[PDB]
């Protein structure tokens, strides 16, 4: 069983075009993942204080 | 300003260059008064009194 860094180098990290392709795909997916995680950390820290936390008693 | 600039040769050079340096200072002063139109100096030269400056 090949190691996963060896598999990563053989499939994606060898050719520079595939390197840039996986860089961009990882950029998109990682931007989504950290946007979700960072906002979730923020509202968990600031639960009960934000406007969307207190919003539900004023629309309806 | 430095210790290498003593002796007869450099004082001879200074004696040769002080009329040229004095004339350069003179033209610098005349250019300064002509540029700034300094009344305190220009009020004594005769023709320029007609300028009132």
């Amino acid at each position: 069983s090949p190691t996963i860094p060896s598999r990563l180098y053989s499939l994606l990290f060898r050719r520079t075009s595939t390197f840039a392709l996986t860089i961009a795909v990882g950029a998109l997916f990682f931007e989504r993942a950290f946007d979700q995680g960072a906002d979730a950390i923020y509202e968990h820290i600031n639960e009960g204080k934000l406007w969307k936390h207190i919003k539900h008693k004023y629309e309806n | 300003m430095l210790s290498r600039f003593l002796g007869p040769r450099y004082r001879e050079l200074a004696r040769n260059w002080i009329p040229t340096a004095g004339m350069w200072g003179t033209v610098g002063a005349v250019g300064l008064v002509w540029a700034t139109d300094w009344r305190l100096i220009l009020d004594w030269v005769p023709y320029i009194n007609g300028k009132f400056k």
Partner: protein, 32 residues
């Protein structure tokens, strides 16, 4: 002579897959 020029031991800096000289590389170059 020039034969006395020997590379010193670099084992304080080598990677974990490189520390031995009896095991050939290119089974770990991809991983590194």
């Amino acid at each position: 002579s020039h034969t006395d020029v020997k590379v010193p031991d670099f084992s304080d800096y080598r990677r974990a897959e490189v520390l031995d000289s009896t095991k050939s590389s290119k089974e770990s170059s991809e991983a590194r």
